[PDB]
Design a protein around this ligand. Structure first.
Ligand SMILES: NC(=O)C1=CN([C@@H]2O[C@H](COP(=O)(O)OP(=O)(O)OC[C@H]3O[C@@H](n4cnc5c(N)ncnc54)[C@H](OP(=O)(O)O)[C@@H]3O)[C@@H](O)[C@H]2O)C=CC1
Ligand SMILES: [Zn+2]
Lengths: 95, 146, 125, 294, 86, 206, 134, 114
């Protein structure tokens, strides 16, 4: 989600950008501001919600021992999804 | 939780009024010379000070000394305390003489015109502690607050 | 063979400390307060000596926290306040001593939770 | 003040002085001392250079990481000047050449280039401008170097009226072309030390009263050129070029009491007797001071 | 040019401040009756030597020791301060 | 038990017996003798006894600690005598090690042990350099590890980690200069101690 | 406007409702060009030609002891006496009570959160006010 | 309050060692300036020696005086034997340090330190 400020500088995923009167942007003159274009916040928002048939579901992040510590997610509330605190994947109880 | 207010609306530079009538940043030397010039042209009742709620004692005495050196005595605070009788002559006239810890030794507490819950929350906690563990009797004159 | 020296022990001139970091510093001698987040008391046993905090500013390049205070991280440990004070005095540091805070003994009774006629009766467990 | 240029620290290498300075002509004699003093206190220095990057290497250790920034520029390209100065709070012009070349005569280096920097700096909103001229700058001098200096000093004053103009006498130092010039071989001279000139420039940046003023930087004493040159040989143990360069050396250093000098900026002028050995030691093949005009 | 403020320092227990304590207990109310607009700041603090401070115009201050004084020696000392306009 | 270090009672008993042996022979100087749970014998002595105790351990036929493995100091600011001087000796004849410890302060000199072991010459120079303990009658006492003209004794607990001065090359004076230390990133002090006691066996009386 | 320090940015003395003197310690230094409050006044007095006679925090604390000695007895509650004399002077000049009932400025939790400049600037306190009033 | 001495039993003998050290430093300065090709004068060097000696004039403990003489003799040996380089000798003069402000007002303008 790389947006650019009125002065032409790209805004990073952490929201950083030098303002108009900031001398520090001189460092980029003749060079470039390194910005990662793959915003993890926009990428996780694309994954679909996983429909499951239990009140409790577990997430290890995928890949077994290559993922994150295994956590159990309660799905009792029906006004929102259960989100993994480690990887951001979402879950919802069916019916 | 109010510490985060220390990161907003902060005064970081000396300011003076320009010709357009607006506050604008200046240096310490410029700002203090402006104030020092005015302080040297006034005396007595022409100079006064008001101390706000969060002022430390080192600044209170420094300001009192400076205004006294122009023979000013109008060193005021925002909070009022009646000056009738002894006024601030005797410390016992304006102190919590029992002390916070002394509340645990009292057997009757009379509250007059105070909501201690929101004025001195930890003092109110002490009162409830005695209420709970000492069967303290509490009476209140004022609005019937929780 | 021994000699008599009746002078106050002062070693400021043989420690190599710059003068500014002797005369202008204020040592604080104290027992650290228990971290309220935890119940353990093992970090409240010894006396600590630390110095007054000084300016930290943002590094223009990275934003890191820069300092010019050489004693910004210096914390010393003592068995008693007397040892701490003795160390401070011979090194020329002006200091403040704060008396040790100890929790006062409490009177605990599980049975008071069920009082027949006192307010200590709990309404839930 | 923008929050990034509020001074912090104790005025050392990792401190923030709050100065953002573009120094034109930073790769010469005077440039290296000015950049050194700026970087000593944690200033952001922008160095536009015409030369190879190899010839700028001696400037890199002069500032903490990130504080010295290098840019390519061309004296005849206003776009390159704008790139260098538009982020700065002060522009310093040290461009010059003691001789003319096929591509740059004295009119190009002492009039056109200074005017271009002053104008572009003015447009870009730069608040401080320090321009070095010359004590003996004179529209009617016999030296074309000094004639061009006087013309350029006028053009800069009208283009950037708040500019600080500094007029030093001949500067001596390790890398000078004054004491070294004699060592490699009617008129009174008042030479000034290189470090005094630098300290004066730095104090002018920090002094608000310096804006719009013209200064003359001169040494504490005046010498007869013959007596001075005699002194140089004695110190070097040496037994006692262009035509334009000879004209300047034979120009008596002007006395200008109506201009402030190093004293008005807090700099104590350094006698030539305390520093000649430092410069002239390298000329010895392994002393009675010169008579001063009072 | 005259007087602006009086401050009296004393201990709560020490015998050296006994005369000062007696003076306050017996003479202060009448003294304050005669000088309603004069600040007489009484400030007790344990184990201090009793003292009398008079502040005059333009921040001029003097102090007179009251150590071991009697209730009368205190009375005269206040009397001297009130009469004098340093 | 696979993960626990096994004890050795035979060596513990032998070292305890020899510790008493030394204490009986040099009661003028020995203040304390202890054997750790991993069988290291420590003789704590009055500092006047450095030369006599070391000479006896080197030369006695029932000792023969011919090798000075190491000599160092420990700074403990809470003590009246802040500096603990440690000698680690090796006996090849009896295949044993022993540790002799004494103490001094910033102003009291310790007798140099170069007469007993020539190895001590540089070790004592390092102690003087790093802790500022003076050794009397040293053949050539002077700094050894720090830069020339270096002020202070870095290994003292109250000496700051990064020191007081730092070096850089200055072009104006054409040499390396020293200036007060400023750090672009301050060292970040960490509070790591758990507020819960780990080892009851070492609890101190309250 | 002269930018001063906050209680988190100075070692300064405050006396609580019991009369107990306590001091803060510097946790961070004041932002920007702000300065310690007593130092601003001490600097102003020098430029105005009426220099105050203290140059350090310890000296301005020796001044505090000259005015009221209990201000430098940190963590001590110095007892205050002579309630009898104060009561006598109280009875000297009667004044009338107003019929208005005693009503505290803060009647419910919403009035608690914002009461000074720091809390009035706090975004967290604003959320607390919004939560209880809505 | 009975202590083992270093070299001197009292201030009288300590002061004798101080004077001998000063004489050695005073006479060494001319050689140092020449050997290290320093750009200061002999007067400047001898003024620094006095300045270094004078800053310790307040010591009344013969043990502290003894250590100061020991360190001063070490510093002299490094210079005489040319273990120091030009940079080490010239560090006594701090010629790249800007003079730090002294009065209250100057210190008030630049920052928060005392
Ligand atoms: N030193 C003296 O005796 C005195 C000097 N001055 C003035 O001080 C300033 C500097 O003095 P000094 O440092 O001795 O001069 P130097 O020749 O030592 O330095 C000259 C600087 O100007 C730059 N420069 C020259 N011509 C051009 C050009 N055509 N385009 C771009 N950059 C150019 C050089 O860059 P490069 O290295 O790329 O050539 C160099 O950085 C000059 O203005 C000089 O006239 C005034 C009075 C006395
Ligand atoms: Zn997951």
């Amino acid at each position: 989600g790389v947006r650019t400020s009125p002065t032409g500088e790209k805004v990073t995923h952490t929201g950083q950008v030098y303002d108009d009167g900031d001398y520090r942007k001189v460092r980029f003159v003749g060079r470039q501001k390194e910005v990662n274009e793959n915003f993890a916040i926009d990428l996780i928002a694309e994954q679909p919600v996983s429909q499951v048939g239990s009140r409790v579901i577990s997430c290890d992040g995928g890949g077994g021992a290559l993922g994150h510590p295994r956590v159990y997610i309660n799905l009792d509330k029906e006004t929102k999804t259960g989100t993994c605190g480690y990887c951001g994947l979402q879950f919802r109880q069916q019916h | 939780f109010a510490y985060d207010g220390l990161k907003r609306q902060r005064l970081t530079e000396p300011m003076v009024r320009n010709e357009k009538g607006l506050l604008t940043h200046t240096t310490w030397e410029d700002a203090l010379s402006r104030v020092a010039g005015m302080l040297q042209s006034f005396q007595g009742n022409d100079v006064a000070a008001i101390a706000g709620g969060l002022v430390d004692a080192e600044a209170l005495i420094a300001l009192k000394d400076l205004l006294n050196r122009v023979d000013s005595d109008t060193l005021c605070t925002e909070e009022v305390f009646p000056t009738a009788g002894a006024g601030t002559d005797l410390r016992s006239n304006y102190l919590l003489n029992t002390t916070i810890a002394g509340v645990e030794e009292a057997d009757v507490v009379l509250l007059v015109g105070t909501n201690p819950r929101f004025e001195a929350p930890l003092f109110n906690a002490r009162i409830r502690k005695s209420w709970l563990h000492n069967d303290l009797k509490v009476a209140l004159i004022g609005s019937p607050v929780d | 063979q021994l000699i008599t020296v009746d002078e106050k022990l002062d070693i400021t001139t043989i420690t190599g400390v710059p003068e500014e970091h002797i005369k202008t510093r204020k040592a604080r001698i104290f027992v650290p307060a228990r971290n309220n987040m935890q119940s353990g008391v093992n970090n409240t046993k010894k006396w600590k000596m630390e110095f007054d905090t000084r300016e930290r500013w943002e590094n223009p390049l990275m934003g890191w926290a820069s300092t010019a205070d050489p004693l910004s991280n210096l914390v010393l440990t003592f068995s008693t306040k007397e040892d701490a004070v003795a160390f401070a005095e011979k090194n020329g540091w002006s200091y403040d001593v704060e008396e040790r805070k100890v929790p006062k003994p409490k009177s605990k009774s599980y049975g008071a939770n069920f009082s027949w006629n006192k307010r200590t009766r709990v309404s839930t467990k | 003040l923008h929050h990034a240029v509020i001074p912090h620290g104790k005025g050392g290498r990792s401190s923030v002085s709050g100065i953002v300075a573009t120094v034109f002509g930073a790769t010469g004699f005077l440039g290296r001392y000015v950049v050194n003093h700026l970087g000593r206190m944690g200033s952001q220095v922008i160095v536009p250079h015409r030369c190879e990057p190899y010839d700028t290497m001696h400037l890199r250790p002069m500032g903490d990481l990130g504080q010295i920034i290098f840019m390519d520029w061309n004296g005849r390209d206003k776009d390159s000047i704008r790139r260098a100065v538009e982020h700065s709070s002060v522009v310093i012009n040290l461009v010059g050449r003691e001789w003319e070349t096929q591509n740059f005569d004295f009119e190009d280096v002492f009039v056109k280039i200074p005017q271009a920097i002053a104008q572009v700096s003015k447009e870009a909103g730069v608040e401080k401008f320090i321009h070095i001229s010359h004590l003996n700058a004179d529209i009617k001098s016999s030296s074309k170097y000094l004639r061009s200096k006087a013309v350029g000093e006028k053009e800069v004053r009208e283009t950037f009226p708040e500019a600080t103009i500094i007029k030093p006498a001949e500067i001596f130092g390790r890398e000078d072309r004054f004491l070294n010039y004699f060592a490699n071989i009617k008129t009174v001279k008042q030479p000034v030390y290189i470090v005094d000139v630098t300290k004066g420039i730095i104090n002018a940046i920090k002094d608000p009263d310096a804006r719009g003023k013209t200064f003359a930087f001169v040494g504490p004493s005046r010498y007869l050129l013959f007596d001075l040159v005699q002194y140089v040989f004695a110190v070097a143990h040496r037994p006692f070029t262009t035509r334009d360069k000879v004209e300047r050396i034979h120009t008596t250093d002007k006395i200008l009491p109506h201009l402030p000098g190093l004293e008005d900026l807090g700099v104590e002028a350094t006698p030539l007797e305390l520093k000649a050995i430092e410069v002239l030691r390298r000329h010895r093949t392994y002393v009675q001071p010169a008579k001063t005009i009072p | 040019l005259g007087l602006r403020e009086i401050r009296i320092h004393l201990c709560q227990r020490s015998p050296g401040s006994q005369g000062v304590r007696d003076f306050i207990e017996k003479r202060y109310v009448e003294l304050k009756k005669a000088n309603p607009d004069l600040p007489i700041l009484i400030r007790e603090c344990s184990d201090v030597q009793p003292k009398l401070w008079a502040r005059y115009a333009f921040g001029q201050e003097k102090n007179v020791s009251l150590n071991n004084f009697s209730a009368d020696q205190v009375t005269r000392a206040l009397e001297n301060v009130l009469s004098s306009k340093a | 038990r696979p993960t626990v270090r096994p004890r050795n009672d035979v060596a513990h008993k032998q070292l305890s017996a020899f510790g008493e042996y030394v204490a009986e022979i040099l009661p003028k100087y020995v203040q304390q003798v202890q054997v750790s749970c991993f069988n290291e014998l420590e003789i704590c002595i009055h500092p006047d006894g450095v030369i006599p105790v070391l000479t006896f351990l080197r030369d006695h036929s029932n000792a023969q600690f011919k090798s000075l493995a190491d000599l160092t100091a420990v700074d403990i600011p809470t003590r009246q005598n802040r500096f603990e001087i440690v000698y680690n000796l090796l006996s090849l004849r009896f295949n044993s090690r022993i540790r002799v410890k004494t103490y001094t302060d910033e102003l009291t000199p310790i007798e140099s042990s170069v007469p007993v072991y020539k190895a001590a010459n540089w070790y004592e120079r390092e102690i003087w350099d790093m802790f500022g303990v003076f050794f009397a009658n040293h053949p050539d006492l002077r700094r050894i590890l720090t830069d020339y003209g270096f002020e202070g004794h870095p290994f003292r607990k109250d000496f700051p980690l990064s020191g007081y001065v730092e070096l850089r090359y200055d072009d104006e004076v054409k040499r390396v200069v020293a200036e007060p230390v400023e750090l672009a990133q301050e060292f970040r002090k960490f509070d790591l101690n758990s507020p819960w006691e780990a080892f009851p066996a070492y609890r101190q009386p309250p | 406007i002269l930018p001063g320090a906050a209680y988190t940015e100075k070692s300064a003395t405050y006396v609580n409702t019991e009369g107990r003197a306590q001091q803060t310690k510097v946790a961070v230094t004041p932002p920007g060009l702000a300065r310690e409050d007593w130092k601003i006044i001490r600097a102003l007095s020098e430029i105005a030609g009426m220099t105050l006679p203290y140059d350090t925090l310890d000296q301005v604390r020796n001044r505090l002891e000259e005015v009221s000695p209990n201000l430098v007895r940190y963590d001590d509650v110095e007892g205050a006496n002579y309630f009898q004399q104060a009561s006598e002077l109280s009875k000297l000049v009667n004044q009338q009570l107003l019929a208005d009932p005693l009503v505290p400025p803060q009647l419910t939790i919403k009035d608690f959160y914002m009461t000074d400049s720091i809390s009035r600037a706090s975004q967290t306190m604003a959320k607390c006010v919004k939560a209880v009033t809505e | 309050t009975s202590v083992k001495p270093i070299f001197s039993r009292d201030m009288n003998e300590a002061k004798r060692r101080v004077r001998e050290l000063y004489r050695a430093w005073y006479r060494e300065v001319p050689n140092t300036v020449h050997l290290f090709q320093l750009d200061i004068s002999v007067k400047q060097g001898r003024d620094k020696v006095r300045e270094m000696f004078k800053k310790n004039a307040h010591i009344t403990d013969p043990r502290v005086v003894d250590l100061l003489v020991i360190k001063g003799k070490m510093e002299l040996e490094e210079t005489i034997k040319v273990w120091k380089q030009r940079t080490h000798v010239m560090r006594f003069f701090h010629e790249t340090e800007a003079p730090r402000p002294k009065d209250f007002l100057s210190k008030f303008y630049v920052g928060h330190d005392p």
